[PDB]
Design a protein around this ligand. Structure first.
Ligand SMILES: N[C@@H](Cc1c[nH]c2ccccc12)C(=O)O
Ligand SMILES: [Mg+2]
Ligand SMILES: [Mg+2]
Ligand SMILES: [Mg+2]
Ligand SMILES: [Mg+2]
Ligand SMILES: [Mg+2]
Ligand SMILES: [Mg+2]
Ligand SMILES: [Mg+2]
Ligand SMILES: [Mg+2]
Ligand SMILES: [Mg+2]
Ligand SMILES: [Mg+2]
Ligand SMILES: [Mg+2]
Ligand SMILES: [Mg+2]
Ligand SMILES: [Mg+2]
Ligand SMILES: [Mg+2]
Ligand SMILES: [Mg+2]
Ligand SMILES: [Mg+2]
Ligand SMILES: [Mg+2]
Ligand SMILES: [Mg+2]
Ligand SMILES: [Mg+2]
Ligand SMILES: [Mg+2]
Ligand SMILES: [Mg+2]
Ligand SMILES: [Mg+2]
Ligand SMILES: [Mg+2]
Ligand SMILES: [Mg+2]
Ligand SMILES: [Mg+2]
Ligand SMILES: [Mg+2]
Ligand SMILES: [Mg+2]
Ligand SMILES: [Mg+2]
Ligand SMILES: [Mg+2]
Ligand SMILES: [Mg+2]
Ligand SMILES: [Mg+2]
Ligand SMILES: [Mg+2]
Ligand SMILES: [Mg+2]
Ligand SMILES: [Mg+2]
Ligand SMILES: [Mg+2]
Ligand SMILES: [Mg+2]
Ligand SMILES: [Mg+2]
Ligand SMILES: [Mg+2]
Lengths: 64, 16, 144, 117, 201
RNA sequence: AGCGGCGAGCGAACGGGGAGCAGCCCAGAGCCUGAAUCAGUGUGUGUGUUAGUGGAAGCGUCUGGAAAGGCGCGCGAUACAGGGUGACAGCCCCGUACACAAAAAUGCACAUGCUGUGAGCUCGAUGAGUAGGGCGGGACACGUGGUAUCCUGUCUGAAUAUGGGGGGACCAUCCUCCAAGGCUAAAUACUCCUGACUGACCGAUAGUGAACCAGUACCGUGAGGGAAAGGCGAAAAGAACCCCGGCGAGGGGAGUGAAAAAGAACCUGAAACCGUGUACGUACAAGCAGUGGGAGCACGCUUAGGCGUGUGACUGCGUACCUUUUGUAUAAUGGGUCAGCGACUUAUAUUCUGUAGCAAGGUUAACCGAAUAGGGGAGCCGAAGGGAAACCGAGUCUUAACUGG
């Protein structure tokens, strides 16, 4: 049988040009009044998955 | 089957 | 050249691991699994993305975005394909007939990649700035 | 393709047992006990190559000591005299002479005593 | 190359890339091995412990019997128990890319010409389907172990050579690397040369 | 794509390439003849099926119990597939390629009678407790969610061709189809059974549980469970007769046989285990039983030189193997021993390495092909990225814009 993609991981990571994965930063869903604006601004843009996690991410997405 | 001194309780439970 | 004078190339036929066949093979007894534990059990192991009970990365990060069916049905076209099309007139159905794009792509675009040296007419496709300059330099025509 | 193991199994077991010829009882009959004996025989053989070198040097020292003390000097002073007179006859040959040619050993003891004196 | 006939003592021109490339033994070996693997039938099966006839009753109770515990009479350890990893009917064929197959045939034909095991003749036929007549004609040509390729399938030649086990007769389209390598001499008619060079391009 | 304690997992369709192709009837009246098409029942022609017939071509010599083997010399082949024959046979036998054969029964495809059935044309009609709705469930990849669509247990309930359904909440426009009646070959699924052929399938602890009078013996009240056990020799020529013995069992002669070192407990005949004979050692000597040194004794010797083989008095060192452990002589685990069996495999998908082909290209899948060839480029991966997305594109996004990032 074909390998099955982990669908939650497919919804949360997209692949980039050189083979990395981009993801959205955590901690920007609520409690935003007491979070500071500098912290929220730096949490706003998308980021890259690190070296400690690329292995798990690729193992969850065989078809990306 | 099994030995009666293994089925018994006073000698099997000898060191509780 | 007989049936018993043919041999494969060097290094092309490395033989597989044979686990558990004595001390000297280096894979005897446990066979590369260590001592005890879930990973040496037969059929043992964890699933993908398991981190020992800590919340996995694909569940502590937030989801984002949505999916566009227009992006699913739109393709992009190289200038090399633009030259490879047959007939000298570049339309959606001509590209489909020349197998540049599949049958369900409705919108197409020509991008600056490769090079064009044959004067061709583009009709009914969006064209980027660099591709328009390259086609007009090569001596073509861009319709609307 | 099914493989039957009778011929190879018999060959390996007979190789071990032919090595274990001469041992007491099940160590020369029974394959398991014979295999445990042949490995130990090899370990002892390796260790005893080393110990053979040690034991034979020990025996030569004892014989040189006895002959030198018969000729009126101790082994340590005899060897000091030879190393001071720069004679390089080793202990194997010195014990050989000390047994078979007593006059030559008398000459060597006199040379060592002259070198010390 | 140029191929020199012997019945007509003439010359025939053939392609550089078809009859004059080097012998690439790794490709030729891969295609020969794949031909044998595709020739495999692979019909066999053994019974696992799911399939041996028997019951699922535990042979004796778990504790207290004094025997090493057992849970099924069909265990692969036991005598008359199933096979542990019992084989099933499987497909032994391998894929060869078309360009690798064509390269292997070109290398084989080039090596045949290089070692001079390929005899080109103008016409090759027998009058009547008589194996004696074909054997006499091959003894005249001084050939024993021969693969004879012919452009058109001839019924008389095929019936004549059906019984000689060192002589095979093939049509142009049906040549294969194992037969070309195995047979000692190969006899090409001119029509077969044209058809082979055409299909090899 | 979607569904999903948005977890584990489940997972389409649109569209594209093939295999195969076939359309009709009632809800109703009239002209017309019973016409197309289907079933049964007969009758002819082919093809089979159930018995079968013919089917080529070798001798001499040597070893050998025996020739099919060695050596020499011939012949057949639309037949050198296979089996048997005293060792391995194209030419000894049964066969095979090929050419034929059916009194009788029957299958199929035609053609043709009878029975039943009706086609063609015109006009008309267009399946009501139904569609839909409320409540509860179920099926759709879709877990009630914004949920389309299908089915219905309960309660209701239209329009009906000037009409109605669907197009994924819903409304409007447009497109496309006509529910509430039914019939229909092929491509497709399987093998208790029959025949032929095949096998990088097994070869008596294997292969069916079962090569043998096996679902037997035996076990259980019963459902049910469920074995072990193949081989003399080419041919029984299977040991006439004599002797010991209980008118035994068993044996020794004789005899057959190539061989009884094949005698029916029968090809070969391993190991554990049990003995008989010979050489050496051992009755003042302490322990994983060996190893290093080593005298003597006995037997072979072929440079008369010591060597080789068997033993081993005495002697230095020396607490088994596996496992599991920080650590085992461990008084922790396992094993009475021998022999046979017993544990990282297979299929599909994905990434990395090596190697081989082609190279900005590579490669086909299903299927056709008698075809491991050839066709098939449907597709898939790659040559372009950025963004959530529209979109822009060697750029893009962020932002009102970047010196920027
Ligand atoms: N020992 C006694 C009693 C007995 C029978 N079965 C037993 C089982 C467990 C203990 C004791 C018993 C006997 O043999 O008759
Ligand atoms: Mg928010
Ligand atoms: Mg190791
Ligand atoms: Mg542990
Ligand atoms: Mg273990
Ligand atoms: Mg571990
Ligand atoms: Mg398991
Ligand atoms: Mg295409
Ligand atoms: Mg076998
Ligand atoms: Mg013995
Ligand atoms: Mg079995
Ligand atoms: Mg192909
Ligand atoms: Mg005959
Ligand atoms: Mg003969
Ligand atoms: Mg024989
Ligand atoms: Mg209707
Ligand atoms: Mg309803
Ligand atoms: Mg509704
Ligand atoms: Mg409806
Ligand atoms: Mg609707
Ligand atoms: Mg059996
Ligand atoms: Mg046997
Ligand atoms: Mg009974
Ligand atoms: Mg008798
Ligand atoms: Mg025999
Ligand atoms: Mg026997
Ligand atoms: Mg024996
Ligand atoms: Mg004493
Ligand atoms: Mg004594
Ligand atoms: Mg003692
Ligand atoms: Mg000691
Ligand atoms: Mg450890
Ligand atoms: Mg402990
Ligand atoms: Mg210790
Ligand atoms: Mg003890
Ligand atoms: Mg212990
Ligand atoms: Mg334990
Ligand atoms: Mg024990
Ligand atoms: Mg893009």
């Amino acid at each position: 049988p074909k390998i099955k993609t982990v669908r939650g991981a497919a919804k949360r990571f997209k692949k980039t040009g050189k083979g990395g994965f981009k993801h959205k930063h955590a901690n920007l869903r609520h409690i935003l009044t007491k979070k500071a604006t500098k912290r929220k601004r730096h949490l706003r843009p998308k980021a890259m998955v690190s070296k400690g996690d690329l292995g798990l991410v690729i193992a969850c997405l065989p078809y990306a | 089957t099994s030995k009666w001194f293994n089925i018994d309780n006073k000698i099997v439970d000898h060191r509780p | 050249m007989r049936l018993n004078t043919l041999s494969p190339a060097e290094g092309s036929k490395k033989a597989g691991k044979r686990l558990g066949r004595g001390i000297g093979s280096g894979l005897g007894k446990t066979g590369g699994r260590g001592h005890k534990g879930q990973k040496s059990r037969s059929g043992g192991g964890v699933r993908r993305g398991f981190e020992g009970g800590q919340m996995p990365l694909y569940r502590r990060l937030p989801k984002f975005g949505f999916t566009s069916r227009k992006a699913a049905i739109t393709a992009e076209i190289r200038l090399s394909d633009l030259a490879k099309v047959e007939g000298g007139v570049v339309d959606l159905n001509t590209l489909k007939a020349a197998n540049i794009i599949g049958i369900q792509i409705e919108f197409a675009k020509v991008i600056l990649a490769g090079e064009v040296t044959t004067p061709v007419t583009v009709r009914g496709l969006r064209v980027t700035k660099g591709a328009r300059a390259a086609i007009e330099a090569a001596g073509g025509k861009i319709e609307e | 393709a099914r493989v039957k193991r009778g011929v190879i199994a018999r060959a390996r077991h007979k190789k071990i047992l032919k090595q274990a010829k001469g041992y007491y009882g099940a160590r020369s009959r029974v394959y398991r006990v014979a295999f445990q004996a042949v490995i130990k025989a090899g370990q002892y053989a390796y260790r005893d190559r080393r110990q053979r070198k040690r034991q034979f040097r020990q025996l030569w020292i004892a014989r040189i000591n006895a002959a030198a003390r018969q000729n009126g000097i101790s082994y340590s002073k005899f060897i000091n005299g030879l190393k001071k007179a720069s004679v390089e006859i080793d202990r194997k040959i010195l014990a050989d002479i000390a047994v078979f040619d007593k006059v030559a050993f008398t000459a060597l003891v006199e040379k060592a005593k002259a070198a010390l004196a | 190359m140029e191929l020199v006939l012997k019945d007509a003592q003439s010359a025939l021109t053939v392609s550089e890339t078809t009859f004059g490339r080097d012998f690439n033994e790794a490709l030729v070996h891969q295609v020969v091995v794949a031909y044998a693997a595709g020739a495999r039938q692979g019909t066999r099966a053994q019974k696992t412990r799911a399939e041996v006839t028997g019951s699922g009753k535990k042979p004796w109770r778990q504790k207290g019997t004094g025997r090493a515990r057992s849970g099924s009479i069909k265990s692969p350890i036991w005598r008359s128990g199933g096979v542990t990893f019992a084989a099933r009917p499987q497909d032994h064929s391998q894929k060869v890319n078309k360009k690798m197959y064509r390269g292997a045939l070109k290398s084989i034909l080039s090596e045949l010409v290089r070692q001079d095991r390929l005899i080109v003749v103008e016409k090759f036929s027998v009058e009547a389907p008589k194996t004696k007549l074909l054997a006499q004609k091959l003894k005249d040509m001084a050939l024993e172990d021969v693969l004879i390729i012919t452009g058109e399938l001839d019924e008389n030649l095929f019936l004549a050579a059906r019984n000689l086990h060192k002589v095979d007769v093939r049509d142009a389209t049906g040549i294969d690397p194992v037969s070309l390598i195995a047979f000692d001499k190969v006899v090409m008619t001119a029509d077969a040369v044209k058809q082979v060079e055409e299909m090899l391009a």
